[PDB]
Design a binder for this molecule. Structure first.
Ligand SMILES: C=CC1=C(C)[C@@H](Cc2[nH]c(/C=C3N=C(/C=C4\NC(=O)[C@H](C)[C@H]4CC)C(C)=C\3CCC(=O)O)c(CCC(=O)O)c2C)NC1=O
Ligand SMILES: C=CC1=C(C)[C@@H](Cc2[nH]c(/C=C3N=C(/C=C4\NC(=O)[C@H](C)[C@H]4CC)C(C)=C\3CCC(=O)O)c(CCC(=O)O)c2C)NC1=O
Ligand SMILES: C=CC1=C(C)[C@@H](Cc2[nH]c(/C=C3N=C(/C=C4\NC(=O)[C@H](C)[C@H]4CC)C(C)=C\3CCC(=O)O)c(CCC(=O)O)c2C)NC1=O
Ligand SMILES: C=CC1=C(C)[C@@H](Cc2[nH]c(/C=C3N=C(/C=C4\NC(=O)[C@H](C)[C@H]4CC)C(C)=C\3CCC(=O)O)c(CCC(=O)O)c2C)NC1=O
Ligand SMILES: C=CC1=C(C)[C@@H](Cc2[nH]c(/C=C3N=C(/C=C4\NC(=O)[C@H](C)[C@H]4CC)C(C)=C\3CCC(=O)O)c(CCC(=O)O)c2C)NC1=O
Ligand SMILES: C=CC1=C(C)[C@@H](Cc2[nH]c(/C=C3N=C(/C=C4\NC(=O)[C@H](C)[C@H]4CC)C(C)=C\3CCC(=O)O)c(CCC(=O)O)c2C)NC1=O
Ligand SMILES: C=CC1=C(C)[C@@H](Cc2[nH]c(/C=C3N=C(/C=C4\NC(=O)[C@H](C)[C@H]4CC)C(C)=C\3CCC(=O)O)c(CCC(=O)O)c2C)NC1=O
Ligand SMILES: C=CC1=C(C)[C@@H](Cc2[nH]c(/C=C3N=C(/C=C4\NC(=O)[C@H](C)[C@H]4CC)C(C)=C\3CCC(=O)O)c(CCC(=O)O)c2C)NC1=O
Ligand SMILES: C=CC1=C(C)[C@@H](Cc2[nH]c(/C=C3N=C(/C=C4\NC(=O)[C@H](C)[C@H]4CC)C(C)=C\3CCC(=O)O)c(CCC(=O)O)c2C)NC1=O
Ligand SMILES: C=CC1=C(C)[C@@H](Cc2[nH]c(/C=C3N=C(/C=C4\NC(=O)[C@H](C)[C@H]4CC)C(C)=C\3CCC(=O)O)c(CCC(=O)O)c2C)NC1=O
Ligand SMILES: C=CC1=C(C)[C@@H](Cc2[nH]c(/C=C3N=C(/C=C4\NC(=O)[C@H](C)[C@H]4CC)C(C)=C\3CCC(=O)O)c(CCC(=O)O)c2C)NC1=O
Ligand SMILES: CCC1=C(C)/C(=C\C2=NC(=C\c3[nH]c(CC4NC(=O)C(C)=C4CC)c(C)c3CCC(=O)O)/C(CCC(=O)O)=C2C)NC1=O
Ligand SMILES: CCC1=C(C)[C@@H](CC2=N/C(=C\c3[nH]c(C[C@@H]4NC(=O)C(C)=C4CC)c(C)c3CCC(=O)O)C(CCC(=O)O)=C2C)NC1=O
Ligand SMILES: CCC1=C(C)[C@@H](CC2=N/C(=C\c3[nH]c(C[C@@H]4NC(=O)C(C)=C4CC)c(C)c3CCC(=O)O)C(CCC(=O)O)=C2C)NC1=O
Lengths: 164, 251, 177, 164, 164, 164, 177
């Protein structure tokens, strides 16, 4: 699971040496930017369910042909799978937002997602429509903070550049 | 479920439930019961025979050397064993994954025979030491046959990067990334690597040519199936073909 | 890999003292017996495939079940591996004659071999028989009493060295069983 | 040459990934601890020559047998080589103090120094006497700063743990 | 443990072949030079204790700063460790002198000694002063033999070229 | 090309060590057994032609079926190739007899001979008949020397154990 | 790897004849001069770090530009590589003294090294100077005329062998330029 701590510890470990001053400056930076990260994590854990509803209802505000045949709209169950998968993605943005690297977001969500999505006929552009909605639905001074919002955008854009 | 209602199967559920959780080596469990030391001596017989096939005469070849200078072979052995314990260090799923790739590569390597398939599929360390010592004895490896023309050196550098992708998943380095485990043997691995690259020039030109065609045949048979453009790169460039490693390595 | 020198040195290292007089005296007996050891090793070397062919062919001729289908001498591949292993046993025994100590033979070849031959299904009694025939053939060459080759050497007693080579073959054949 | 920048960029390079938020937090920390580093570098470049004189004259305040035979005291030339080599060490503490890792100090000074020192009969404990002098001659509130002093101690202790 | 026997047997072993005439000439040479080797070993085991006393007391005839602080002179115990370590070195010159190669002297004494010496703050030049004393205190016609002394010089010079 | 010199030098070269006393003992043995070797080489270079005649005419004293069909006896030319090849083997016993290992006899004669012999339908037992003749045609006190003869026997027996 | 023996044999192989009288006679001069060669190798071996330190330190003391920043002796690691390469040259020169022929030195170490030092930017004149200092130091040790180490040997003329070692060092130093 990638973070600042694991990157610098793993680097000095592969080197063999004790942790010198450079690693100490790195973790110093982590506990500098910690406040903006945890602010965004607190507010995301605050109102996540409304982000679930507007997220998935925004995904079916776009492409309608999912609820058409036999692509995926064929039950309350597949639409529930739809929502809970989006909740897995937001819960990973919470996790990676707390950690401060793209670690748990990548190793739990992104790695090997592609084979599962081509295999189970899942379109990725539907998810990308959902996330581009949820990053367009921000607010600069009233929603989080100038620093927190930026960090949230970063995480979410990472998901988009991972999926497209 | 059906064991638990039986008086006897309440034993079986507890033994199986005790066994279930814990990780293990493929060396530990893949062989038949009581045949691990046979596998260690098996693999030792393999590597000793390839060491016989490298030097047919009493003169050691320029490549069959450990230390360039005094006090370097002791740093080569002290660097050599920490890699082995580090092979013991890693996680279980990685061990079985590296095991199955060792199996597939050993099977491509055999190019025939039941014993070759049966003994390499039965016996794990036989497969690992087989692949390493065989590709090692033909000269199909990274440290030898480095590129001459600048284009081939760049291509070899790109292959080296794309194997470094395997040897770091997700920013965090491997278990097996092992330049240190000491104070300052990483510089010794630099010294030994640079000097081995110097010693590949010292070989006979006969062994240079045999090394080239062996490199091409290696990268074809293991890693090229169809792959007409990769067939063309394995045609023309011996440095690209010389340095493709089974992802059991992660070196 | 330890010769008789290294055995004296290692025993003195466990004793943690200097080497001394008596141990060096027994090693003086080794050096004075050196040329006999050298000619003995020359005798056992200059009959490689001769002793291996007679030993293993005699092993099959004793027990004809090995050459039966279902046996282990049955396949050509198996017979080549058979001859190779006999050559290798003879090879490290020859190393044990140059060294004077069986450390090369014990740490090289004799270790783990019983569990390997059990792991493959090679019968141990046939192996011990072949090692015994190499033992008798090697002592008959080492005493120059072969009925097929009688080479000129300056005459002399070499009984102790014959008991030494017999101790190496009895070590291997005793170890495979 | 190791620093925070080269470690994180080299780590993401070996990964193949674009530099995500974690590397950005690391370089954020580098530009947080930059002020203490550059303060100590400014004051070192200020009065280095007095550190030269008290360093080498402290090394000959201890062990006298260098200027005895034929070990190294036999000229003004070997004592000049003495001083200038200590100035190479302080110039590397300046360099690594500016960089913010042990990079140039290790790759220019420490790498392969040991074979040169055992080969040309140089005892290391004389250098260690010099450096333990120069770290014992500190001053907390007047010399640099609480933060700058600490960074200097770190670099110098690294030299000691590299040599012994 | 390197000797003539182990070199030629190991070489023919890596070859795979039986020992040909070349190995036989090599061991012939070993039993030619055996007399000079074992003569020197007998006389070393004769008067080793005087070599102990003059060796260590020669090492403290040179550099006095061992018995100064806290380097190594601070007890009867460290001076006892001093003497017994020199006895380990002479016992290895006896062992390698019996064997006839640099085998046990290297694999027991020289292998990894350097890290122990830089780690436990031991200068090598003190040992080198002791050995250069014990090779300067020879005697050509009376001590061993013309041939035997030479072998002793060889082993001792090997120790010096191993340490410096 | 294997000899005592090349074996020990190659071994210490792979080790990285300078030539220590063990190699020196080995080459000492080479220059001890040198006299017997060069004696045998002189006498072989003396009357090689009679060894040619008796060798080949002994090989056609046995197996007649070479000069029968179409195996190899169908000309004076194939029988000339027969003789000259035996002269190549005696010239290699001269070479290896000078060198004092099985080096040039193996790397010029024995290496890859098997494929040439099964390929060109040349039977090996005919060569072995020739050599067993030429080692039975020795003489202890009149031909060479007790020591010298033995060296010759060694090399010739080696050819036999290489071919059978 | 070719010694004196192997040079005589290879030249006789190109001539396609047997060994004969004259070549063996020159090789008898080798064997009779064997012990002088043995003691000579002992002399050059027992001054490893001594010859290397003096040679390379003298090379820097002659031309102080190498230790100037931007030089080749300037990095501490580069200086260790510098000492290591001088030790390696000395090593294969010692092997050329045991062998009697410079085939191990030509095919081992003198091969590829000019193009390597051109490929790294090591100046050739400084290397030839260091090889020359190893040459003079090695001749002074080999004749036992060292200014602080004077070891007992029964006296004799060894001029030929000194010109031989001078030919090896002049081969290396002539080859790097
Ligand atoms: C975890 C992350 C997370 C977010 C990023 C927000 C996103 C978000 N904003 C709103 C809701 C809102 N967001 C804004 C913000 C805006 N006002 C404007 O003038 C600008 C266009 C914009 C600021 C830049 C407003 C005004 C509303 C209320 C809209 C309304 O009720 O009309 C809602 C609906 C629930 C609510 O009313 O609060 C949600 C989910 N909520 C979350 O839980
Ligand atoms: C410990 C396990 C272990 C093994 C499994 C073997 C594997 C193995 N086989 C060979 C070597 C060989 N193996 C074969 C076998 C083959 N002949 C064919 O017709 C078939 C394709 C195939 C049998 C099914 C042959 C012919 C050689 C010799 C190849 C050659 O020299 O051309 C070698 C090289 C050394 C040698 O020549 O013996 C090795 C390592 N060796 C070991 O130590
Ligand atoms: C400098 C030269 C150079 C090359 C020639 C290539 C060669 C090459 N190809 C792959 C890797 C690959 N190459 C192919 C190609 C194939 N797909 C098929 O259906 C065919 C058999 C074949 C095309 C003809 C595939 C599919 C992979 C990925 C294999 C996998 O991950 O399963 C890799 C491993 C790294 C990676 O995943 O990219 C390398 C080194 N790379 C280089 O740097
Ligand atoms: C350096 C030491 C050394 C050894 C101790 C052997 C040990 C050994 N033998 C075999 C393999 C073998 N060993 C034999 C030998 C024989 N089986 C019989 O039934 C006969 C009685 C007997 C000959 C007398 C045979 C036939 C095989 C192949 C099949 C088998 O396992 O029995 C193998 C597997 C590889 C192969 O097939 O060659 C190994 C490692 N090999 C070595 O390199
Ligand atoms: C380089 C190769 C090389 C060898 C192959 C040996 C050969 C050798 N053997 C002996 C000498 C001898 N060799 C033997 C050997 C034996 N006699 C018997 O009756 C037994 C059959 C046999 C048991 C091994 C004996 C008994 C002697 C004489 C006794 C002795 O010298 O110890 C001698 C002494 C000199 C001489 O006799 O002219 C030599 C040189 N030495 C070497 O340097
Ligand atoms: C870039 C960094 C850098 C360094 C730190 C130095 C380190 C260094 N010093 C020396 C070399 C030397 N250094 C000293 C110094 C000493 N004299 C003594 O009495 C004391 C123990 C000690 C001073 C405290 C001496 C005397 C030599 C010469 C040693 C000799 O030739 O015997 C050498 C070998 C080359 C030379 O002779 O100049 C090197 C690499 N050089 C560099 O390039
Ligand atoms: C087993 C190995 C072994 C050695 C290597 C020697 C080493 C040795 N030599 C001496 C002692 C001595 N060694 C010599 C020898 C000579 N001094 C000269 O000036 C001459 C050049 C040279 C003779 C050629 C002398 C004269 C002494 C006594 C005085 C002295 O220390 O020089 C002593 C002190 C005890 C004594 O007085 O005998 C010792 C331990 N002894 C041993 O037992
Ligand atoms: C350096 C060592 C060296 C050798 C030892 C020879 C060995 C040798 N002989 C032949 C080739 C040959 N050798 C013989 C000899 C034989 N005729 C018979 O009746 C007998 C069985 C046998 C003599 C005892 C013959 C007849 C040929 C030619 C075979 C043919 O063309 O059918 C060849 C193939 C090339 C050629 O045609 O000359 C070679 C490599 N050559 C070498 O370079
Ligand atoms: C380079 C090695 C080399 C050898 C080893 C010899 C081998 C050899 N011996 C003879 C020839 C001979 N060799 C002997 C020797 C023997 N007398 C007997 O009573 C015993 C059985 C035996 C001594 C043990 C005799 C008697 C002859 C002459 C045979 C005769 O003319 O009848 C010949 C034929 C030429 C000749 O007449 O000299 C040759 C080639 N020659 C060599 O060039
Ligand atoms: C077995 C044979 C063998 C060789 C022939 C050398 C050859 C060699 N030298 C260097 C590398 C080097 N070689 C030297 C040596 C020196 N440069 C100078 O300017 C001085 C004049 C000179 C010392 C006298 C230096 C300084 C380097 C490192 C930098 C460079 O390339 O110059 C390298 C690259 C690896 C490294 O940095 O160590 C190699 C392969 N190495 C070997 O293992
Ligand atoms: C196995 C290793 C091995 C060696 C290292 C040599 C060592 C050696 N050198 C000589 C003997 C000798 N060594 C030298 C050498 C020289 N004298 C000088 O004054 C010059 C400085 C130097 C030039 C090389 C001389 C001159 C002799 C005596 C003359 C002679 O024996 O030819 C002897 C004769 C016996 C004795 O003196 O006791 C021996 C065994 N021989 C070996 O077997
Ligand atoms: C076939 C037997 C053989 C061997 C084993 C050999 C050389 C050899 N390679 C060795 C090491 C060694 N060999 C390999 C094999 C290898 N695996 C690969 O994927 C590639 C491209 C390899 C290069 C041959 C590795 C990874 C290493 C690790 C580097 C290290 O441990 O320092 C060693 C051991 C010590 C050392 O020299 O550093 C030795 C002695 N040359 C040979 O012919
Ligand atoms: C019919 C199935 C069959 C065989 C095959 C042989 C195999 C055989 N050889 C023996 C023993 C044996 N074998 C040889 C080697 C052999 N003899 C030589 O003179 C030369 C040149 C040889 C290789 C070509 C020697 C030297 C001996 C010792 C007896 C003797 O002095 O001849 C022994 C006795 C074993 C013992 O003493 O316990 C046997 C059983 N016997 C059989 O029943
Ligand atoms: C001030 C900077 C400086 C140095 C450092 C020296 C370095 C030096 N040593 C030389 C040469 C040299 N060096 C030694 C080795 C040395 N002598 C011994 O007796 C022992 C035991 C040694 C190692 C401890 C020998 C043996 C010689 C040969 C001359 C002689 O006979 O002493 C030469 C002559 C080179 C030549 O002939 O071309 C030089 C320049 N010179 C300097 O100007």
């Amino acid at each position: 699971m990638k973070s600042v701590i694991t990157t610098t510890i793993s680097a000095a470990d592969a080197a063999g040496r004790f942790p010198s001053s450079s690693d100490l400056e790195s973790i110093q930076g982590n506990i500098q930017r910690a406040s903006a990260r945890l602010e965004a994590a607190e507010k995301l854990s605050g109102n996540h369910e409304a982000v679930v509803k507007e997220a998935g209802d925004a995904c079916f505000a776009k492409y309608s042909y999912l609820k058409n045949s036999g692509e995926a709209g064929d039950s309350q169950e597949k639409i529930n799978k739809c929502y809970r998968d989006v909740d897995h993605y937001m819960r990973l943005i919470n996790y990676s937002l707390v950690v401060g690297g793209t670690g748990p977001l990548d190793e739990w969500g992104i790695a090997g997602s592609r084979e599962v999505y081509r295999t189970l006929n899942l379109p990725g552009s539907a998810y990308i429509a959902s996330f581009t909605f949820t990053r367009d639905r921000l607010c600069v001074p009233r929603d989080m903070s100038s620093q927190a919002g930026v960090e949230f955008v970063a995480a979410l854009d990472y998901v988009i550049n991972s999926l497209s | 479920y059906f064991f638990a209602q039986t008086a006897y199967g309440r034993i079986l559920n507890m033994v199986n439930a005790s066994r279930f959780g814990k990780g293990g080596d493929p060396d530990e469990l893949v062989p038949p019961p009581g045949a691990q030391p046979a596998d260690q001596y098996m693999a030792n017989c393999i590597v000793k025979q390839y060491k016989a096939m490298a030097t047919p005469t009493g003169v050691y070849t320029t490549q069959c050397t450990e230390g360039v200078v005094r006090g370097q072979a002791e740093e080569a052995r002290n660097a050599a064993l920490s890699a082995a314990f580090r092979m013991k260090q890693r996680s279980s799923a990685q061990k079985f994954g590296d095991f199955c790739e060792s199996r597939r590569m050993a099977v491509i390597g055999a190019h025939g025979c039941s014993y070759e398939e049966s003994l390499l599929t039965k016996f794990p360390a036989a497969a690992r030491a087989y692949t390493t010592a065989s590709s090692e004895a033909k000269g199909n490896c990274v440290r030898y046959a480095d590129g001459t023309s600048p284009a081939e050196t760049y291509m070899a550098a790109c292959v080296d990067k794309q194997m470094k992708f395997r040897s770091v998943p997700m920013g965090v380095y491997d278990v097996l990334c092992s330049d240190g485990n000491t104070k300052g043997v990483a510089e010794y691995k630099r010294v030994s690597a640079m000097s081995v690259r110097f010693r590949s020039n010292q070989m006979s030109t006969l062994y240079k040519m045999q090394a080239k065609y062996n490199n091409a045949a290696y990268a074809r048979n293991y890693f090229g199936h169809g792959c007409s453009y990769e067939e063309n790169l394995f045609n023309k460039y011996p440095a690209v073909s010389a340095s493709m490693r089974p992802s059991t390595a992660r070196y | 890999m330890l010769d008789a020198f290294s055995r004296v040195v290692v025993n003195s290292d466990s004793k943690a003292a200097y080497v001394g007089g008596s141990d060096l005296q027994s090693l003086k007996t080794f050096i004075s017996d050196g040329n006999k050891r050298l000619d003995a090793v020359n005798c056992i070397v200059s009959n490689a495939s001769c002793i291996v062919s007679d030993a293993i062919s005699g092993m099959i001729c004793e027990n004809p079940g090995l050459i039966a289908p279902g046996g282990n001498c049955y396949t050509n591949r198996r017979m080549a591996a058979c001859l190779r292993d006999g050559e290798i046993i003879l090879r490290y025994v020859s190393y044990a004659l140059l060294a004077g100590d069986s450390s090369v033979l014990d740490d090289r070849c004799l270790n783990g071999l019983k569990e390997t031959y059990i792991a493959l299904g090679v019968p141990t009694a046939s192996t011990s028989r072949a090692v015994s025939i190499m033992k008798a053939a090697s002592t008959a060459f080492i005493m120059n009493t072969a009925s097929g080759r009688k080479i000129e050497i300056a005459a002399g007693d070499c009984q102790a060295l014959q008991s030494e080579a017999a101790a190496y073959f009895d070590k291997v054949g005793s170890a495979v069983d």
